[PDB]
Paper text:
We created two omalizumab-derived Fabs, namely FabXol2, with Ser81Arg and Gln83Arg mutations, and FabXol3, which additionally contains a Leu158Pro mutation. One omalizumab-derived Fab, termed FabXol3, which contains three point mutations in the light chain, subsequently enabled us to solve the 3.7 Å resolution crystal structure of the complex with IgE-Fc, revealing that omalizumab inhibits binding to Fc∊RI allosterically. To understand the effects of the Ser81Arg and Gln83Arg (VL) mutations on Fab crystal packing interactions, we solved the structures of FabXol2 and FabXol3 alone. Both FabXol2 and FabXol3 crystallized in the same crystal form, with one Fab molecule in the asymmetric unit. With the exception of the light-chain residue 158, which is leucine in FabXol2 and proline in FabXol3, the structures are otherwise essentially identical. In FabXol3, Arg81 contacts Pro158 (Cκ), while Leu158 is partially disordered in FabXol2. As the overall structures of FabXol2 and FabXol3 are similar, further discussion will be limited to the FabXol3 structure, which was solved at higher resolution (1.45 Å for FabXol3 compared with 2.05 Å for FabXol2). The FabXol3 CDRH1 and CDRH3 conformations are markedly different to those in the FabXol, scFvXol and FabXol1 structures; the nature and implications of these conformational differences are discussed later. Comparison of the FabXol3 structure with the structure of the complex with IgE-Fc reveals that the positions adopted by Ser25–Ser31, and Tyr33 in FabXol3 would not preclude an interaction with the C∊3 domain; however, Gly32 would clash with Ser378. This particular CDRH1 conformation thus appears to be incompatible with IgE binding. Engineering the Ser81Arg and Gln83Arg mutations in the VL domain of the omalizumab Fab clearly disrupted the interactions seen in the FabXol structure, but these residues also formed new packing interactions in the FabXol2 and FabXol3 structures that were seen when these molecules were crystallized alone.
Residue numbers in the entry:
A (entry chain H): 2 to 134, 143 to 221
B (entry chain L): 1 to 216
The structure:
């Protein structure tokens, strides 16, 4: 079973978030609880809402009043809406499925989370530049907003020796990151190295060949 | 709400070590003979993974080096022999009373021997310079411990205020870190100078290591 969240990205302060979690279609949802749990950047985990098979909801009083959880079993999907968004609401939002222990719940299955960024700024896609060449080579992914960017190498075939650095917030208010890989220097004239960069908020997908 | 306090907030332990972390709840999480405390592992960038439910039961498939114990207010998670991939933040979580609540996490870092970095310097690409800015990058690869100093020099003059650094989370196989330092200048300013150098200090290096290039 897989849980896949959608609806993340930028939201204006005072606006509404609308997230969804799609669950593998083969799975039956009735013997479980369905939850949203969030994690602000650098902080711990906060449970915010749950729903059970009969539509019964439960909310954390920390946000109760501006949150609603709902379900559409015809699409095996659950939803979260929050209104009146503020800075405390910037976080990765995870959907999680609870299983029973003697009438109580534990979160045995989690989605991979979606980042919601509460901001009045515009989305901006990155530029991608080579860090040309044990040898080291890489790609610099500059000036994007909001997070996140993902990088892979050679479509995921090159993983050993890859280091993708955490993004840094520049004085411009835009992020930058680099991804580097160390490879055998002899392999350089013979093997192609392509960094695959994805910034889904700006629909940016770049495959940049890094040559010597 | 029930508050969960974990101890210690962070620890460093070597590969093979027995690691114990504690969670104290502000009231008992027992009901009718069982204790409603769960534990999760969260590796950087990933969602949490359930390890232990109801204080002491291992979720099926979790490695047997993980175990939990406790009752009432007091709970422990033990890793009997730590592996490098066990670097993570570990959270306890109570399911006894709504709202369900988590501890603040304990970060487990792997201790290992000191390793000096290897250092690489990258000039700005011509594609970036065409766009008006120059990013010069200095890479420190696979070193331990995390603490390191990088000083930029431009035609020998020490720089400050025009660089930013980023460090990886600890590596899950070799327990090292890598660090990038980026110096950012306009194209015009970059083209006024010849020698760009980064000077690195680290415990594993008896004297600082400089890497440099001549523009062009």
């Amino acid at each position: 079973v897989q849980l896949v969240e959608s609806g993340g990205g930028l939201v204006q302060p005072g606006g509404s978030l609308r997230l969804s979690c799609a669950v593998s279609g083969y799975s039956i949802t009735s013997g479980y609880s369905w939850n949203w749990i969030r994690q602000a950047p650098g902080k711990g985990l906060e449970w915010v809402a749950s729903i059970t098979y009969d539509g019964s909801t439960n909310y954390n009083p920390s946000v109760k009043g501006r949150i609603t959880i709902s379900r559409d079993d015809s699409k095996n999907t659950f939803y979260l809406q929050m209104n009146s968004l503020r800075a405390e609401d910037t976080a990765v939002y995870y959907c999680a499925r609870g299983s029973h222990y003697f009438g109580h719940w534990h979160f045995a299955v989690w989605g991979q989370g979606t980042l919601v960024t509460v901001s009045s700024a515009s989305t901006k896609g990155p530029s991608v530049f080579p860090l040309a060449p044990t040898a080291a080579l890489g790609c610099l992914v500059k000036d994007y907003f909001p997070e996140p960017v993902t990088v892979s190498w050679n479509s995921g075939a090159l993983t050993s020796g890859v280091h993708t650095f955490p993004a840094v917030l520049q004085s411009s208010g835009l992020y930058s990151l680099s991804s580097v890989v160390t490879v055998p220097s002899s392999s350089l004239g013979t093997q192609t190295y392509i960094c695959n960069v994805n910034h889904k908020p700006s629909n940016t997908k770049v495959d940049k060949k890094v040559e010597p | 709400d029930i508050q969960l306090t974990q101890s210690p907030s962070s620890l460093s332990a070597s590969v093979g070590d027995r690691v114990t972390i504690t969670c104290r709840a502000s009231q008992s999480v027992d009901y009718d003979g069982d204790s409603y405390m769960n534990w999760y592992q969260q590796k950087p960038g990933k969602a949490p993974k359930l390890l232990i439910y109801a204080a002491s039961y291992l979720e099926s498939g979790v490695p047997s080096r993980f175990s939990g114990s406790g009752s009432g207010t007091d709970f422990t998670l033990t890793i009997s022999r730590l592996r490098p991939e066990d670097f993570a933040t570990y959270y306890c979580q109570q399911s006894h009373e709504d709202p369900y609540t988590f501890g603040q996490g304990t970060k487990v870092e792997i201790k290992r021997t000191v390793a000096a970095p290897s250092v690489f310097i990258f000039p700005p690409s011509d594609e970036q310079l065409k766009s008006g800015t120059a990013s010069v990058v200095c890479l420190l690869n696979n070193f331990y411990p995390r603490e390191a100093k990088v000083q930029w020099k431009v035609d020998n003059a020490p720089q400050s205020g025009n660089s930013q650094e980023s460090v990886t989370e600890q590596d899950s196989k070799d327990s090292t870190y890598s660090l990038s330092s980026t110096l950012t200048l306009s194209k015009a300013d970059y083209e006024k100078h010849k020698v760009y150098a980064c000077e690195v200090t680290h415990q594993g290096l008896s004297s600082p290591v400089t890497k440099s290039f001549n523009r062009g």
